Design an enzyme around this catalytic site. Structure first.
Site, PDB file in Angstrom:
ATOM      1  N   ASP A 102       6.480 -50.769 -17.794  1.00 30.27           N
ATOM      2  CA  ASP A 102       6.999 -50.018 -18.944  1.00 30.27           C
ATOM      3  C   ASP A 102       8.369 -50.530 -19.409  1.00 30.27           C
ATOM      4  O   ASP A 102       8.693 -50.410 -20.580  1.00 30.27           O
ATOM      5  CB  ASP A 102       7.046 -48.514 -18.646  1.00 30.27           C
ATOM      6  CG  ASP A 102       8.022 -48.154 -17.560  1.00 30.27           C
ATOM      7  OD1 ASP A 102       8.138 -48.889 -16.565  1.00 30.27           O
ATOM      8  OD2 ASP A 102       8.680 -47.123 -17.706  1.00 30.27           O
ATOM      9  N   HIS A 103       9.151 -51.100 -18.494  1.00 30.99           N
ATOM     10  CA  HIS A 103      10.384 -51.814 -18.829  1.00 30.99           C
ATOM     11  C   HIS A 103      11.003 -52.508 -17.620  1.00 30.99           C
ATOM     12  O   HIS A 103      10.511 -52.385 -16.519  1.00 30.99           O
ATOM     13  CB  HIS A 103      11.409 -50.843 -19.398  1.00 30.99           C
ATOM     14  CG  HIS A 103      11.571 -49.604 -18.582  1.00 30.99           C
ATOM     15  ND1 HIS A 103      12.331 -49.567 -17.439  1.00 30.99           N
ATOM     16  CD2 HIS A 103      11.088 -48.355 -18.760  1.00 30.99           C
ATOM     17  CE1 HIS A 103      12.301 -48.348 -16.939  1.00 30.99           C
ATOM     18  NE2 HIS A 103      11.559 -47.592 -17.726  1.00 30.99           N
ATOM     19  N   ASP A 134      11.899 -49.967 -49.054  1.00 24.88           N
ATOM     20  CA  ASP A 134      11.513 -48.965 -48.064  1.00 24.88           C
ATOM     21  C   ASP A 134      12.547 -47.825 -47.986  1.00 24.88           C
ATOM     22  O   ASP A 134      13.244 -47.630 -46.978  1.00 24.88           O
ATOM     23  CB  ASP A 134      11.255 -49.631 -46.700  1.00 24.88           C
ATOM     24  CG  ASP A 134      10.555 -48.723 -45.723  1.00 24.88           C
ATOM     25  OD1 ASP A 134       9.744 -47.888 -46.144  1.00 24.88           O
ATOM     26  OD2 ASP A 134      10.812 -48.854 -44.528  1.00 24.88           O
ATOM     27  N   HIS A 154      17.784 -48.207  -9.986  1.00 22.21           N
ATOM     28  CA  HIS A 154      18.937 -47.451 -10.497  1.00 22.21           C
ATOM     29  C   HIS A 154      19.970 -47.277  -9.408  1.00 22.21           C
ATOM     30  O   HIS A 154      21.144 -47.077  -9.712  1.00 22.21           O
ATOM     31  CB  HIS A 154      18.570 -46.035 -10.926  1.00 22.21           C
ATOM     32  CG  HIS A 154      17.763 -45.955 -12.167  1.00 22.21           C
ATOM     33  ND1 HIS A 154      18.300 -46.146 -13.414  1.00 22.21           N
ATOM     34  CD2 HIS A 154      16.473 -45.629 -12.358  1.00 22.21           C
ATOM     35  CE1 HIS A 154      17.361 -45.974 -14.328  1.00 22.21           C
ATOM     36  NE2 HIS A 154      16.242 -45.664 -13.708  1.00 22.21           N
ATOM     37  N   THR A 213      11.037 -44.750 -20.129  1.00 20.60           N
ATOM     38  CA  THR A 213       9.713 -44.553 -19.576  1.00 20.60           C
ATOM     39  C   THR A 213       8.757 -43.761 -20.452  1.00 20.60           C
ATOM     40  O   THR A 213       7.669 -44.227 -20.773  1.00 20.60           O
ATOM     41  CB  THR A 213       9.824 -43.914 -18.205  1.00 20.60           C
ATOM     42  OG1 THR A 213      10.585 -44.795 -17.359  1.00 20.60           O
ATOM     43  CG2 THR A 213       8.457 -43.734 -17.579  1.00 20.60           C
TER      44      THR A 213
HETATM   45 CA   LIG Z   1       8.021 -47.255 -47.752  1.00 10.25          CA
HETATM   46 ZN   LIG Z   2      10.331 -46.319 -16.549  1.00  9.17          ZN
HETATM   47 ZN   LIG Z   3      14.612 -45.226 -15.094  1.00 11.76          ZN
END
Ligand SMILES: [Ca+2]
Ligand SMILES: [Zn+2]
Ligand SMILES: [Zn+2]
Ligand SMILES: CCn1cc(-n2c(C3CC3)c(Sc3cccc(C(=O)O)c3F)c3ccc(Cl)c(F)c32)cn1
Ligand SMILES: CC(=O)N[C@@H]1[C@@H](O)[C@H](O)[C@@H](CO)O[C@H]1O
Length: 751
Positions: free
Chosen positions: A297-298, A631, A254, A148
């Protein structure tokens, strides 16, 4: 003081956050949190006198005052619910006088899986209308970690979590020598919070944001009533952006898992709150004046206590480490200067110990690049990716959780745009949440602060744009050397077929040569001693010699590889695909040669020999562009010379950290790749150039049982390769620039 005549003001405190700081006045609750007689008007209450104790009102005076119950007009004046009403196109923001801009309301929902929409009109009639009637996407990709705090600030800032610094729901900052937690006071310190969030990007540009954050403890009805109250404020106090946040459907999820039967209700409850918002806006004449973003958010996966790996089963001195557990692992030394903390020994002992193992250790530099999850001091060197449905813990009441790899179907989430400036009944493809700051900035006439979205990649969401994108200027133009040197000078030891969409633009200062051949075309870096790109086109039905165009000074040499005990070489254009044997000798030019570790050549060769042919039969031809990527500092940006930490032992031949390919065909595959009139289809990857195959627990078997899997895990956006190379691709096509951007933000997950 007292909050008398001051509830939910914009600046003893009486604003929406005052609870959070334990500072709201003694009579905050009494006056500001009124709960009497519920939130709906009912038949008995039409025509009443105003009463101050009530939660919301059903008298005639409420409409001006701003505070009728959101269904007053339904129950008492005959009017219908918004939900009940037909889909009507909004071709212009029908706002009242002195509304400069269509105001904007971001409606966050927590843990809202994109699959929850399947459920649909039975469970959420209001949300469904927003989807049905506006602009939606089958799903929206979050960012990793799919938690979150990292995901909400990414919507706010347009930045990856390594950039804005909220890298996790919980983090240790080794410089602050302090830690950040969901529950606690440490998070309130702004020092943790970089970028420029949308509320700050607006303030600075004169567009009013209000008090933007609500105290969680205030119920959802009081929040949406107050929002409607503020939208009847005179033009000098009124904000033009608003945000609402539901901690559901995550809280329930959850507890009961995402496919729980007990989810039906928390989502209907939410749709309750959404309907109140549209009902409320319709009774203020604002329902065809405001842009509303329904966003998550997910999502949420199935996860139970008994799917939990234990480090103590893999490691001996486990009391020496600190572990951020759950759907990811982060590991650092518990104790300060404990020399019996060896990170090499930890990674090694976690690698492929157990056949059944449900995680994989990485040095953050070695995480797939698409996750852009390394460049922060609060990302510890050792990271564990966890398999969907599983939990990692340190030493030996919930059914769902989240935090996994953001390419995972259960971690996907929703987006719906609806309002005056959003398209009408328009379905659009999936995109990443990092592209939403810019759009949200387009909806308020704001210039976006520097971010990770690609501004213009989302203009097909809207009916009109205040932003036209333009290609970036080409910093270094190419040399086109003819034949210039002899084979005596060396001490070593097309555009119709192969460059289908124009050359990449080199976006930094250097010298480089374009080189033509029968089978391929290449841009060849004099600074780096190899190509920056090699383009070539396999059609559906398909020794190292000096390059006489390039100086000995600017070429590589086989001798260097004899010095290096660990490094071998490979070729960008694969000899295995040359059209004739005359032409095959072109593939062995020193200018197509690139330094590869044996462990890498197995992956490279499999790709070149088996998969390209494969993908060229499957997709009716492909145009591949491959090159190297440096990189060393893992910022996700191409490296300057002074950053490369590895050369081929003895030489100036720099070692890549990764190698990329960009694979493109006609989306309409009835037309071959080279004879294609409409839009493109693309797929891509960046593979870590490591000297072992310790990532692939199956590496011991034949390459067909593990290489293609490794590649899929390191799928990448064209844009990611652009950041890493400072090249710019697809600059000469038959397609409109904003469509090319969309093409360039596309990630081919394989789910
Ligand atoms: Ca780089
Ligand atoms: Zn969340
Ligand atoms: Zn959660
Ligand atoms: C520096 C820019 N910034 C970041 C926040 N910000 C905060 C405050 C600092 C803790 C939270 S946390 C929170 C919020 C609201 C209420 C409460 C509460 O305890 O009642 C709370 F804990 C937050 C969450 C998501 C996003 Cl995108 C932010 F920008 C968040 C506010 N400004
Ligand atoms: C991979 C990448 O480009 N990340 C960029 C970062 O380098 C930049 O500082 C920030 C602000 O523009 O947005 C992000």
């Amino acid at each position: 003081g007292s909050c008398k005549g001051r509830c939910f003001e914009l600046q003893c405190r009486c604003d929406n956050l005052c609870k959070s700081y334990t500072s709201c006045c003694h009579d905050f609750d009494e006056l500001c949190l009124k709960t009497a007689r519920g939130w709906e008007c009912t038949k008995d209450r039409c025509g009443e006198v105003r009463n101050e104790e009530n939660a919301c009102h059903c008298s005639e005076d409420c409409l001006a005052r701003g505070d009728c119950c959101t269904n007053y007009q339904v129950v008492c004046k005959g009017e219908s619910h918004w939900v009940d009403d037909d889909c009507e196109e909004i071709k212009a923001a029908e706002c009242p006088a002195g509304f400069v801009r269509p105001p904007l309301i971001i409606f966050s929902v927590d843990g809202f899986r994109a699959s929850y929409m399947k459920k649909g009109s039975k469970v959420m009639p209001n949300i469904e209308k927003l989807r049905s009637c506006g602009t939606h996407s089958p799903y929206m990709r979050p960012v990793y970690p799919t938690k979150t705090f990292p995901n909400l600030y990414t919507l706010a800032t347009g930045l990856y979590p390594e950039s804005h610094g909220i890298v996790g729901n919980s983090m240790y900052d080794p410089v602050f020598d302090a830690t950040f937690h969901l529950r606690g006071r440490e998070k309130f310190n702004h020092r943790w919070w970089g970028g420029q969030p949308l509320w700050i990007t607006a303030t600075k540009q004169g567009v009013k944001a209000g008090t933007f954050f609500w105290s969680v403890v205030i119920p959802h009805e009081r929040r949406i009533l107050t929002i409607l109250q503020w939208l009847t404020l005179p033009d000098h106090e009124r904000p033009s952006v608003y945000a609402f946040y539901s901690e559901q459907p995550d809280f329930s999820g959850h507890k009961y898992g995402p496919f729980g039967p007990e989810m039906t209700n928390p989502l209907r409850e939410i749709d309750k709150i959404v309907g109140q918002l549209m009902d409320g806006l319709k009774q203020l004449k604002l329902h065809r004046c405001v842009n509303v973003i329904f966003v998550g958010d997910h999502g949420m996966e199935d996860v139970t206590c008994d799917r939990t790996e234990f480090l103590s089963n893999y490691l001996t001195n486990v009391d020496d480490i600190t572990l951020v557990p759950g759907t990811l692992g982060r590991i650092r030394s518990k104790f300060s200067n404990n020399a019996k903390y060896d990170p090499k020994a930890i990674i090694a002992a976690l690698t492929c110990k157990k056949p059944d193992q449900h995680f994989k250790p990485y040095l953050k530099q070695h995480l797939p690049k698409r996750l852009h999850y390394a460049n922060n001091r609060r990302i510890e060197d050792i990271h564990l990716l966890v398999e969907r449905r599983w939990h990692v813990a340190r030493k030996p009441f919930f059914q769902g959780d989240h935090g996994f790899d953001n390419k995972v179907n259960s971690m996907q989430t929703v987006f719906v745009g609806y309002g005056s400036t959003f398209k009408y009944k328009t379905k659009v493809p999936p995109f990443e949440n990092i592209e939403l700051y810019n759009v949200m900035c387009d909806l308020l006439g704001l210039k976006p602060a520097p971010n990770n979205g690609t501004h213009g990649s989302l203009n097909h969401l809207l009916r009109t744009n205040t932003f036209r994108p333009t290609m970036p200027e080409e910093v270094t133009r190419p040399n086109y050397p003819g034949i210039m040197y002899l084979q005596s000078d060396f001490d070593l030891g097309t555009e119709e077929r192969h460059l289908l969409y124009g050359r990449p633009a080199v976006l930094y200062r250097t010298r480089y040569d374009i080189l033509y051949h029968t089978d391929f075309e290449s841009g060849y870096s004099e600074i780096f001693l190899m190509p920056l790109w090699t383009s070539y086109t396999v059609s559906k039905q398909a020794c190292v010699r000096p390059d006489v165009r390039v100086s000995p000074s600017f070429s590589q040499n086989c001798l260097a590889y004899k010095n290096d005990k660990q490094m071998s070489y490979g070729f960008l254009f694969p000899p295995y695909l040359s059209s004739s044997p005359e032409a095959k000798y072109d593939a062995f030019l020193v200018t197509n040669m690139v330094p590869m570790y044996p462990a890498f050549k197995r992956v490279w060769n499999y790709f070149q020999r088996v998969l390209v042919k494969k993908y060229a039969s499957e997709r009716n031809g492909v145009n591949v562009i491959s090159g190297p990527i440096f990189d060393y500092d893992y910022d996700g940006l191409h490296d300057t010379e002074d950053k490369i930490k590895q050369y081929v032992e003895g030489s100036s031949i720099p070692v890549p950290t990764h190698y990329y390919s960009i694979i493109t065909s006609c989306l309409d595959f009835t037309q071959p790749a080279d004879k294609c009139d409409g839009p493109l289809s693309v797929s891509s990857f960046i593979l870590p150039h490591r000297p072992d195959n310790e990532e692939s627990c199956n590496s011991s078997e034949d390459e067909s049982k593990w290489v293609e899997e490794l590649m899929k895990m390191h799928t990448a956006r064209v844009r990611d390769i652009e950041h890493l190379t400072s090249l710019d691709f697809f600059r000469k096509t038959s397609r409109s620039y904003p469509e090319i951007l969309t093409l360039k933000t596309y990630l081919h997950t394989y789910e």
